[PDB]
């Protein structure tokens, strides 16, 4: 979070554009048809639900 | 390893086109002056796409 | 019997550039084909024992 220094005048309202945003989703028991490539990498998936 | 095959697996994956909780967290200099951010505790049901 | 992949077969040289993290190597009909050398990084595809 960096208390460090706040430099009043430029960040008076906290922030305007945005520093970062972390996403937290939740995994669910799902059936995934995985398509493997000739190199062994997954290119696309399909969820039945 | 699997070379150009189709495989079906039953595990815990993130469903497509769902609702993910973007949580913006950073120093927030308040109008009064007290600095805060977005900070609670997020539960870990059985997995997290962080 | 490599790292526990017990089986009989002819171990030949393979063009199976495995993604850098796998080891078992199976098929669609779930047959345990290519296996990576536990010691070195060589991949020998197995075949039926004639």
Task: Write out the two tokens for A12.
Answer: 């008076």
| C21 three-state secondary structure | coil
Query: What resolution in Å is listed for this PDB structure?
Result: 3.2
| Residue A25 at interface with chain B, using a CB cutoff of 8 Å | yes
Q: Give C39 to chain A, closest Cα distance, Å.
A: 21
Q: Give C47 to chain B, closest Cα distance, Å.
A: 16
Residue carrying structure tokens 């970062």 = A20
Residue carrying structure tokens 């979070």 = A1
CB neighbours of C49 closer than 8 A, spacing ≥ 6? C8, C9, C10
Q: From the list B4, B8, B29, which residue is nearest A38 (CB)? A: B4
Give the burial class of A49: count Cβ atoms within 10 A of its Cβ; 0-12 exposed, 13-18 middle, 19 or more buried. exposed
Rounded CA gap, B40 and A41, in Å? 37
Rounded CA gap, C50 and C47, in Å? 8
């Amino acid at each position: 979070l960096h208390r460090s220094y706040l430099t009043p005048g430029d960040s008076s309202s906290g922030w305007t554009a945005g520093a970062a945003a972390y996403y937290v989703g939740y995994l669910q028991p799902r059936t995934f048809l995985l398509k493997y490539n000739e190199n062994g990498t997954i290119t696309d998936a399909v969820d039945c639900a | 390893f699997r070379s150009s095959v189709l495989h079906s697996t039953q595990d815990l994956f993130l469903p497509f086109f769902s609702n993910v909780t973007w949580f913006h967290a950073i120093h927030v200099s308040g109008t009064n002056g007290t600095k805060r951010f977005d900070n609670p505790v997020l539960p870990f049901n059985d997995g997290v796409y962080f | 019997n490599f790292n526990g992949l017990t089986g009989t077969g002819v171990l030949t040289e393979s063009n199976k550039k495995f993604l850098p993290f796998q080891q078992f190597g199976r098929d669609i009909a779930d047959t345990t084909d290519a296996v990576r050398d536990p010691q070195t990084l060589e991949i020998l595809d197995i075949t039926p024992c004639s």
